[PDB]
Structure 1
Amino acid sequence: EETVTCLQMTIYHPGQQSGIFKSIRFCSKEKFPSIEVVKFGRNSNMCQYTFQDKQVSRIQFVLQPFKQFNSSVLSFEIKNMSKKTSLMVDNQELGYLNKMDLPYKCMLRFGEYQFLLQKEDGESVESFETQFIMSSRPLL
């Protein structure tokens, strides 16, 4: 019955009506152990969440959970895994292998993708969940 921290991710893409997100399941919380590292990119064998797009690198970025000091809940860190295209966390540009700790609500922009991320705090630190929502509108 222990609440689980969930990272709500509202995503958008102008060509999303082409099935770019066909590999992604929406409104479905997927439990991940705190040992796991969530990866995004076009490669199905390397990434848990994949996009059918040539402009997407094999691995675009990774999200990993961690505990901030003097905090009893899970937070998340992002790291750009793309040599080619940058990764915008709000107003900040993340080059190849740059990393940042994520706030509770932020916007991810890589290429033409737009991700709105919102962290809902739970009690558990052994696991976390992910949920996706598709936006018909652009996010900015």
Structure 2
Amino acid sequence: TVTCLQMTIYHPGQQSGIFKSIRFSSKEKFPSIEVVKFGRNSNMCQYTFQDKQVSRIQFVLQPFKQFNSSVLSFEIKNMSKKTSLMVDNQELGYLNKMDLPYKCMLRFGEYQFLLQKEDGESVESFETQFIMSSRPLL
């Protein structure tokens, strides 16, 4: 079994078609060497959002292994200079990083992300899933 990272997302103006590039309900497989990146640029980031307020790279999720542990954990890092990244109650500035827990709420600009880590046996690769939310998350 592979370690999945479920990412429920939300945005006020999502009806315009910001998450058209984003593929929902799909466990896309990533190796542990690779680093998942978010933003607007297509060549730099994997998951893109069509918006001017969003930076070229908003943030990055990188997998790792905690000490005395046999499962992948994820670390976040805000790459935006303008907008802050609210990892739960913690404000992450430019290039500030923090280890993500099993469940957390990410907020930037007017976006709302609800990350949720489901553990797995494999450490060589992980997976990522996306779910569109109708109501606001918080």
TM-score normalized by structure 1? 0.98
Residue 62 of structure 1: how far off its partner (Å): 0.1
Structure 2 partner of 1:138: 136
CA deviation vs aligned residue, 1:101-125 (integer Å, no higher than 9, x gap): 0000000000000000000000000
Gaps of 5+ in 1: none
Structure 2 partner of 1:100: 98
Give runs of ≥4 in structure 1 deviating > 3 Å.
none
Count of residue correspondences: 138
Residue 64 of structure 1: how far off its partner (Å): 0.3
Residue 82 of structure 1: how far off its partner (Å): 0.2
CA deviation vs aligned residue, 1:74-132 (integer Å, no higher than 9, x gap): 00000000001000000000000000000000000000000000000000000000000
Taking the aligned partners of 1:46 and 1:136, their CA distance within structure 2 comes to 29
Residue 134 of structure 1: how far off its partner (Å): 0.5
Which secondary structure does the structure 2 equivalent of 1:17 belong to? helix
Residue 51 of structure 1: how far off its partner (Å): 0.2
Taking the aligned partners of 1:52 and 1:116, their CA distance within structure 2 comes to 20
Taking the aligned partners of 1:15 and 1:64, their CA distance within structure 2 comes to 28
Structure 2 partner of 1:19: 17
Structure 1 partner of 2:66: 68
Correspondence 1:84-123 to 2 at 5 A: 84-123=82-121
Which secondary structure does the structure 1 equivalent of 2:42 belong to? coil
Q: What's the C-alpha RMSD, in Å, of the aligned pairs?
A: 0.3
Residue 136 of structure 1: how far off its partner (Å): 0.5
Residue 52 of structure 1: how far off its partner (Å): 0.2
Identical aligned residues as a percent: 99
Taking the aligned partners of 2:13 and 2:66, their CA distance within structure 1 comes to 37
CA deviation vs aligned residue, 1:43-85 (integer Å, no higher than 9, x gap): 0110000000000000000000000001000000000000010
Residue 37 of structure 1: how far off its partner (Å): 0.2
Residue 20 of structure 1: how far off its partner (Å): 0.4
Which secondary structure does the structure 2 equivalent of 1:40 belong to? strand
